Structures are given as C-alpha cells and as structure tokens.
C-alpha cells in the first residue's frame, strides 16, 4: 500500500514514512539508497 | 589447454574517494 503514513519494516530496516513511486535508476546489485548525509533514501521492493 | 596476462595486485586498507555519476556509476577515483 502506498501514499499513506504506514509503519514500514522492509528487509529489517524499520521506521515510519510515506511511500510512493520513484524514478530512481537502481543498479542490479543495488538494494538500499542513501544521500550525502547517511540516511535511508529509497528502498527496492524485495517482492516487487 | 591449447593445441600476456596474470596481473596480480595486493590490496591494503586505504582510504579512497570515488566520484559517483548521476546515474549511480563511478567515473573518477583518487587515492589518499
């Protein structure tokens, strides 16, 4: 489910945040994504 | 078997800095 404030637990990385579609360019060996200051940015869906 | 290679290096803990391209690849690297 997307576009709502949902408690999320992707691959053991737990937290709270709204989720939606993204136009990232993930490489095949890539799972997570961070930014310049080391916080989880985008997660590839393991089942999607 | 048959009827100019073997380049072997040894790594050590060294700080590196890698230039990540906008797509997510790496384009340049410098050794510290």
């Amino acid at each position: 489910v997307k576009n709502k404030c949902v408690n999320f637990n992707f691959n053991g990385l737990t937290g709270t945040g709204v989720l939606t579609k993204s136009n990232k360019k993930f490489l095949p060996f890539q799972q997570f994504g961070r930014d310049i200051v080391d916080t989880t940015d985008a997660v590839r869906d393991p089942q999607t | 078997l048959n009827r100019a290679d073997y380049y072997v290096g040894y790594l050590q803990p060294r700080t590196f800095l890698l230039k990540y391209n906008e797509n997510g690849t790496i384009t340049d690297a410098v050794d510290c």
Binding site: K25, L27, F29, G33, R34 | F16, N21, N23, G24
Partner: peptide, 24 residues
C-alpha cells in the same frame, strides 16, 4: 614457465564497497 616483470597498475582495480545508490 613464467617471468616476474614488474609494471604499474596505473589507475585501476576499483569496485563498489557497498550496494547503496548514490548520485552527484
């Protein structure tokens, strides 16, 4: 057989330490 000539690696031999997307 083989030789033991020594050359320089130049800028070479870099892999991704992790699997985390980054840009700019």
């Amino acid at each position: 057989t083989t030789t033991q000539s020594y050359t320089n690696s130049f800028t070479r031999g870099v892999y991704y330490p992790d699997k985390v997307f980054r840009s700019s």
